[PDB]
Design a protein around this ligand. Structure first.
Ligand SMILES: Nc1nc2c(ncn2[C@@H]2O[C@H](COP(=O)(O)OP(=O)(O)OP(=O)(O)O)[C@@H](O)[C@H]2O)c(=O)[nH]1
Ligand SMILES: Nc1nc2c(ncn2[C@@H]2O[C@H](COP(=O)(O)OP(=O)(O)OP(=O)(O)O)[C@@H](O)[C@H]2O)c(=O)[nH]1
Ligand SMILES: [Mg+2]
Ligand SMILES: [Mg+2]
Ligand code: NA
Lengths: 330, 246, 7, 32, 471, 100, 35
């Protein structure tokens, strides 16, 4: 046993189920579940109902930090912040900008810079520490100096837990909790403890990010969430991987049909064939699926899955599925 | 040589109070006898009587300077216990490292003293240490200057507006894991020592704040308004019931 | 082995 | 250069019109 | 020489008082720091070069320092307290362990190397006074020795060289000169100290140049002392060091993860060739396995097959498929670490919830029937007794955290006070660092709790006051 | 249901309740006898499974080898374990090497 | 009178928690100090 291939075979033999696609679930959890300080909870209702709570939380916070997907910028963004004119400056972080379209990214950045709120298109490889450093620079160069030194600048983080908000919040919470869980002989030996019950989700309400800049973040659990979406919105979310592909309600067939339609809208058939290693430019979606099968023993279901995963990874090219409004085009 | 300074132990027995003037400030230097552990003065009633006179002077003094031998390096547990007793009585405390001329490793000693202070639990962690040589007179004016500075912090007064504006912006910055009642208003009701009144929004008596939150607010007041080396009192006032409820 | 009085 | 890196311009015909049933939630149409 | 005669009389006086085995260290948290903070000296090297044999010969006891022909006899840091004033650290051999068939070999070896390199990188400033690289007599330079030197020159750790197996030369001064010439060619330095010495704890007469080593280690252990009163026996016993700070101990564990310490079975293939053979064999298996072609490229990324990045000592990357699951369970099982804390408090709250929700019957479903008779209450009562009082199965408890720091990290209750508490000094402003020198910690301690983890018996859940089931 | 939720069940000697728990010790002895027996049987199995095979005999299987191979006394020494060419002694039979 | 801590616990509570009889406080065995 020179190379650990037994483990490779063991982990490859367990491919029976994929976490992205469900076989017998008509409803999705990634559209309704979000973690709060008490745990996970299902938030039922559209964001237009909690618009007022979001406005109050924005007024309470010092700045805003939006986390969106660059492929679906306005679909991921909260429409309440777009409808309400808020005075607190906001920094938006668009993930997967290298998968999104460059022209659309530049236009959106110019629009936000003209508006006054800051935009930042990050790659899919950048990390929560990079976003933290960006927030640090934003706070140090935008927010005015406060009067109290023990007081810290508050930022309301707004986004969907699938784009990276949940990952960032969990990382910050875990780091802050471990820093004070691990013993330290240099710090005061205060005989006060904070219990962490085992077997709990351990959600957080407020997370400190830094010490010298004094930045803290408040998370809004059930404020931005897709919920009961429209047909086009659900197709876009399933194509970008935000929601699972339900074998009963939102089929791989329908989402791959949507992908093929949005690709073949313009003269991109030969480019799609070149990306998918097809011997010719596909005339129809069924022909494309059959050619993906030929490139064999695999089924049209596997071909649709391959097409969906290629579009998700970006093997088809850079594409922005959202329609830029006229105020952004100006 | 005003007092009797000998090489023997338990030399001083009665406190000696001397009225003095430093930079136009009338002050009474109170030389007190040494404090001892209970395990030593239990079999010795005369030492316990002298200890009673020593702790008595601490209760009625304004500023208390705790002097320890710096040749030992770090302060002793009982030396830190005295600082906690001074903070409990309500007096500004100052740590003084005497015999600094006889210290060989002054670098490691200064770090050992600083390590002990920043390791303390209560407001004693904000105390400052001053190295002093009673034989050569090593920066004794610096010792008296901080003794006067601690007295100014003792009588220091804070405005009610800034106390409320601080706490308004401090609730949104700190994490409160406990289930407590909201603090409506916070005012400095008394001074020397500065006492602050916290008015809770509840009407139940058993809704007092935990000891973790109390030390959290004391550390906030110290680091913000420079109440370092001075203890701080916190009184919690529960919203009372109206006589004519109607 | 040690088992306390259960009932 | 690389076909996986070039950007794709999406026309305005694939985007469904405003007020369309596939753009509005099913709850609004149900209530109407 | 004035100083050489004083350190010689000191080394003789300290070592003549006896020694004992202090503590074995496997996790970075459980270190001798505290009331047992002696100036330490470690002996690192490849397996079966005489590290434990030199320790046993310095300690004058063959049975104390366990040595054997089979490799892998020492699998964790063995701290030996000599004369209650110094610590001799016996380290595991970095290389392939042949003939050792201990279960969980990959996990035990990865834990052995993780504690080794992270201890050297952390306490290099103290109290680790000197590092001794023990090399075999006539064994050529191998990639394992290359990995050791790369680690040392990146951490900037001064190290001495001890050429063991001195009897192999048989008095050949010419061969020894060519051996140290090959060492100087590989190292690149002429001024590096080298001492050739063999060790036989069974017969004292077979030992040669062995009394000069205890004088050497005492020299490097007393070089921190400044005064002649400190050079005395009382000054060395008073010399102690401070614990590491959270910032520096977290950085070294992040740069040196437990998963990175995976060495080949042989000692000739470097880490680059070892990781390249994994990539070549894995690519062939994917292109040959039919079920592998049934998966998608995004699914392979999820299965870490086709693919932050774990860097080894040399700086090469290791894919996630190379790390076996036994090592992952090892890092999460190590107490007092971030991985164990992440397992208890939740590594990914959003991801773990959806994972548990899918693997179970449902989040809101209770007493469901899948698409006989249930267990009786008299059976459940009997099963509960057999689990609690016979099988000794207990429930998990909570982990505590400092309240004064958890509520506000930028206060004085959390530490890291940038102020200077001592007034009237000029040397305190220059003296800084995570680990400093504190005199007399062995007799005074920090105050309250001084011992580190895994030092005292019957602590935590293992209390002997109320029995096992009470916890 | 009526036994646990609707029946008044008196205590046994409430003065010494802190000793026998309010249950007659003759009933407790009968309950403890049954639980201890079932606890011992479950323990004997667990001890045999931990030590391997059997509890007293361990991994030493009954079919393989003898349980105790020391009946009375056994001499660990083996004759001529050094394999010397001449074990008769320093001088025995023919002289070895020239004298002086 | 008494000075121990478990005196508020009766014999039943002591045997249920698993505590040894504090009245038979044996001291001939030393404590496991870190030698
Ligand atoms: N080397 C050195 N020795 C000092 C210094 N100051 C005081 N001493 C010595 O320390 C001893 C302390 O004597 P006291 O001043 O009476 O000490 P004390 O605290 O008043 O003792 P009690 O009244 O018995 O509690 C003196 O006898 C001095 O010899 C110093 O600055 N340097
Ligand atoms: N001839 C000779 N043999 C030695 C010498 N030192 C060690 N050996 C032999 O080499 C074997 C290995 O010795 P160890 O002390 O176990 O070496 P080690 O580095 O501690 O081995 P590990 O713990 O596996 O790393 C021993 O059994 C000795 O018999 C030496 O100086 N000369
Ligand atoms: Mg005196
Ligand atoms: Mg060894
Ligand atoms: Na005196």
């Amino acid at each position: 046993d020179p190379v650990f291939m037994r483990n490779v075979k063991r982990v490859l033999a367990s491919y029976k189920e994929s976490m992205d696609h469900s076989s017998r679930k008509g409803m999705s959890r990634e559209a309704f579940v979000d973690i709060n300080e008490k745990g996970a909870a299902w938030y039922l209702g559209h964001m237009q109902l909690a618009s007022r709570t979001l406005a109050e939380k924005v007024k309470d916070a010092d700045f805003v930090l939006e986390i969106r997907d660059a492929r679906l910028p306005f679909t991921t963004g909260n429409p309440n912040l777009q409808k309400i004119i808020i005075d607190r400056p906001r920094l938006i972080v668009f993930n997967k900008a290298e998968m999104s379209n460059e022209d659309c990214n530049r236009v959106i950045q110019q629009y936000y810079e003209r508006t006054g709120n800051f935009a930042l298109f990050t790659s899919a490889k950048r990390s929560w520490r990079d976003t933290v450093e960006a927030v640090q620079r934003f706070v140090t160069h935008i927010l005015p100096a406060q009067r109290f030194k023990t007081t810290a600048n508050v930022g309301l983080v707004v986004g969907m837990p699938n784009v990276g908000k949940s990952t960032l919040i969990n990382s910050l919470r875990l780091a802050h909790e471990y820093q004070f869980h691990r013993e330290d002989f240099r710090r005061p030996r205060t005989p006060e403890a904070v219990s962490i019950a085992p077997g709990t989700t351990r959600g957080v309400k407020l997370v400190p990010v830094c010490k010298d800049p004094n930045i803290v973040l408040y998370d809004s659990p059930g404020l931005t969430l897709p919920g009961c979406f429209a047909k086009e919105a659900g197709l876009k979310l399933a194509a970008c991987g935000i929601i699972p592909t339900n074998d009963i309600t939102l089929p791989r067939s329908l989402v791959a049909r949507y992908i093929y339609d949005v690709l073949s809208a313009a003269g991109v058939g030969e480019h799609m064939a070149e990306c998918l290693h097809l011997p010719r430019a596909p005339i129809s979606f069924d022909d494309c699926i059959s050619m993906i099968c030929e490139r064999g023993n695999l089924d049209p279901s596997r071909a649709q899955k391959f097409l969906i995963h290629d579009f998700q990874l970006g093997n088809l090219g850079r594409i922005t599925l959202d329609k830029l409004p006229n105020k952004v085009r100006q | 040589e005003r007092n009797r300074a000998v090489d023997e132990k338990n030399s001083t027995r009665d406190p000696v109070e001397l009225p003095c003037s430093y930079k136009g400030r009338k002050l009474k230097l109170i030389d007190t006898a040494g404090l001892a552990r209970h395990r030593y003065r239990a079999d010795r009633d005369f030492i316990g009587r002298i200890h009673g006179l020593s702790v008595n002077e601490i209760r009625f003094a304004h500023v208390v300077i705790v002097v320890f031998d710096a040749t030992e390096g770090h302060p002793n547990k009982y030396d830190m216990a005295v600082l906690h007793s001074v903070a409990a009585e309500g007096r500004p405390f100052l740590l003084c490292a005497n015999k600094w001329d006889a210290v060989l490793d002054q670098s490691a000693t200064a770090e050992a003293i600083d390590f002990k202070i920043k390791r303390q639990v209560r407001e004693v962690k904000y105390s400052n240490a001053v190295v002093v040589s009673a034989h050569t007179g090593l920066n004794l004016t610096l010792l008296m200057d901080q003794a006067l500075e601690l007295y100014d912090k003792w009588n220091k007064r804070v405005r009610r507006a800034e106390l409320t504006r601080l706490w308004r912006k401090m609730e949104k910055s700190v994490i409160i894991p406990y289930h407590v009642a909201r603090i409506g208003r916070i005012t400095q009701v008394n001074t020397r020592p500065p006492t602050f009144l916290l008015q809770l929004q509840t009407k139940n008596d058993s809704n007092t704040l935990p000891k973790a939150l109390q030390e959290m607010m004391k550390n906030t007041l110290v680091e913000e308004f420079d109440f370092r080396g001075v203890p701080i009192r916190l009184i919690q006032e529960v919203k009372d019931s109206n006589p004519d409820y109607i | 082995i040690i088992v306390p009085q259960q009932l | 250069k690389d076909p996986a890196s070039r950007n794709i311009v999406v026309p305005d015909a694939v985007h469904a019109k405003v007020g369309s049933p596939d753009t509005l939630p099913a709850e609004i149409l149900q209530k109407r | 020489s004035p100083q050489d005669e004083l350190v010689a009389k000191l080394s003789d006086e300290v070592f003549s008082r006896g020694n004992m085995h202090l503590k074995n260290v496997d996790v970075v948290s459980a270190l001798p720091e505290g009331l047992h903070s002696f100036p330490e000296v470690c002996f690192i090297g490849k397996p079966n070069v005489g590290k434990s044999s030199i320790i046993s010969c310095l300690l004058r006891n063959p049975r104390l320092g366990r040595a054997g022909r089979v490799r892998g006899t020492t699998r964790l840091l063995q701290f030996f307290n000599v004369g209650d004033a110094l610590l001799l650290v016996d380290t595991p051999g970095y290389g392939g362990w042949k003939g050792r068939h201990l279960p969980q070999s990959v996990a035990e070896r990865a834990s052995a190397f993780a504690i080794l390199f992270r201890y050297l990188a952390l306490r290099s400033k103290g109290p680790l006074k000197r590092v001794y690289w023990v090399m075999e007599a006539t064994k050529p330079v191998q990639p394992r020795d290359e990995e050791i030197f790369v680690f040392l020159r990146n951490e900037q750790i001064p190290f001495s060289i001890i050429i063991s197996k001195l009897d192999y030369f048989g008095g050949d001064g010419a061969a020894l000169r060519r051996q140290v010439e090959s060492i100087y060619n590989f190292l690149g330095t002429e001024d590096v100290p080298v001492l050739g010495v063999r060790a036989d704890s069974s017969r004292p007469e077979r030992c040669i140049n062995m009394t000069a080593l205890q004088h050497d280690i005492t020299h490097y252990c007393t070089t921190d002392l400044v005064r002649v009163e400190d050079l005395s026996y009382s000054g060395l016993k008073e010399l102690s060091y401070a614990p590491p700070t959270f910032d520096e101990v977290r950085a070294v564990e992040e740069r040196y993860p437990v998963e990175s310490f995976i060495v080949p079975q042989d000692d000739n293939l470097s880490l680059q060739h070892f990781v390249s053979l994994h990539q070549e064999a894995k690519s062939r298996h994917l292109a040959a396995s039919p079920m592998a072609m049934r998966l998608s490229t995004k699914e392979k990324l999820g299965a870490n097959l086709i693919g932050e990045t774990i860097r080894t000592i040399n700086g090469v990357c290791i894919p996630k498929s190379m790390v076996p699951p036994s090592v992952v369970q090892l890092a999460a099982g190590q107490a007092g670490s971030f991985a164990a804390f992440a397992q208890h408090s939740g590594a990914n709250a959003y991801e773990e919830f959806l994972t548990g929700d899918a693997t179970g019957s449902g989040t809101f479903l209770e007493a469901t029937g899948s698409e006989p008779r249930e267990k009786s209450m008299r059976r459940c009562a009997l099963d509960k007794v057999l689990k609690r009082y016979v099988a000794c199965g207990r429930k998990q408890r909570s982990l505590h955290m400092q309240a004064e720091g958890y509520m506000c990290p930028w206060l004085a209750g959390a530490g890291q006070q940038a102020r200077s508490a001592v007034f009237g000094v000029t040397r305190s402003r220059a003296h800084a660092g995570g680990m400093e020198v504190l005199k007399g910690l062995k007799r005074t301690g920090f105050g309250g709790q001084s011992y580190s983890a895994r030092t005292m018996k019957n602590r935590g859940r293992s209390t002997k006051k109320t029995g096992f089931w009470a916890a | 249901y009526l036994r646990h939720n609707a029946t008044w069940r008196p205590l046994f000697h409430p003065q010494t309740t802190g000793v026998h728990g309010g249950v007659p010790p003759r009933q407790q002895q009968r309950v403890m006898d049954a639980i201890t027996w079932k606890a011992v049987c479950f323990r004997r199995g667990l001890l045999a499974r931990r030590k391997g095979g059997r509890a007293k005999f361990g991994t030493r299987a009954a079919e393989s080898g003898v349980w105790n191979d020391v009946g009375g006394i056994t001499s660990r020494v083996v004759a001529n374990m050094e394999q010397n060419p001449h074990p008769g002694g320093d001088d025995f039979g023919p002289p070895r090497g020239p004298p002086k | 009178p008494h000075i121990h801590k478990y005196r508020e616990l009766n014999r039943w509570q002591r045997q249920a928690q698993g505590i040894s009889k504090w009245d038979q406080s044996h001291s001939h065995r030393p404590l496991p100090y870190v030698e």
